[PDB]
Design a binder for this molecule. Structure first.
Ligand code: HEM
Length: 154
């Protein structure tokens, strides 16, 4: 798949809004993820013990990982599909170190779209959400194909 320049623009516009508060959005997304798909929290050795949303919210470690996730994602989106270099190390660690099934990347994709919709209704209408969704689908597709080359699930 391939996004048009129109589509990239919709994604980068809402993204520029996200980047006004990386840590806040990170936290919101990860929390959404953990609340919606609690099995995912188990993958995080450092924060697997967190029992409630309040505990999630007060975790400095959780807030650091949200910033890490978003910074890496942002760098990929800003590539506008030319992300081969960035995907390599992410695919390797997620497939062989962390062991993250594609299914889990679909779950965070869902948390991403949920938070953007909630926080940026003005810049996240139906066309922008379509474009975001295509952007993440490309990402997931390309990561799935690297998983396969690495010898893991796809
Ligand atoms: C938006 C898709 C994702 C991005 C861009 C992302 C990015 C990253 C980055 C940049 C790191 C640190 C470097 C590394 O280990 O490669 C990281 C670590 C990690 N990721 Fe992700 N990740 C994503 C999805 C997920 C999901 C869905 C999970 C689990 C459900 C996951 C689990 C982990 C874990 C367990 C680590 C190590 C945390 C620690 O330091 O113990 N990742 N991720």
């Amino acid at each position: 798949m391939v996004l048009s320049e129109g589509e990239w623009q919709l994604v980068l516009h809402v993204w520029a809004k996200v980047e006004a508060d990386v840590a806040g959005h990170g936290q919101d997304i990860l929390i959404r993820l953990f609340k919606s798909h609690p099995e995912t929290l188990e993958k995080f050795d450092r924060f697997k013990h967190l029992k409630t949303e309040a505990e999630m919210k007060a975790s400095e470690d959780l807030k650091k990982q949200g910033v890490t996730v978003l910074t890496a994602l942002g760098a990929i989106l800003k590539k506008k599909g030319h992300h081969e270099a960035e995907l390599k190390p992410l695919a390797q660690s997620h497939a062989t170190k962390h062991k993250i099934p594609i299914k889990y990347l679909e779950f965070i994709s869902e948390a991403i779209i949920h938070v953007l919709h909630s926080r940026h209704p003005g810049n996240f209408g139906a066309d922008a959400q379509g474009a975001m969704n295509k952007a993440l689908e490309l990402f997931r597709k390309d990561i799935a194909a690297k998983y396969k080359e690495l010898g893991y699930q796809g």
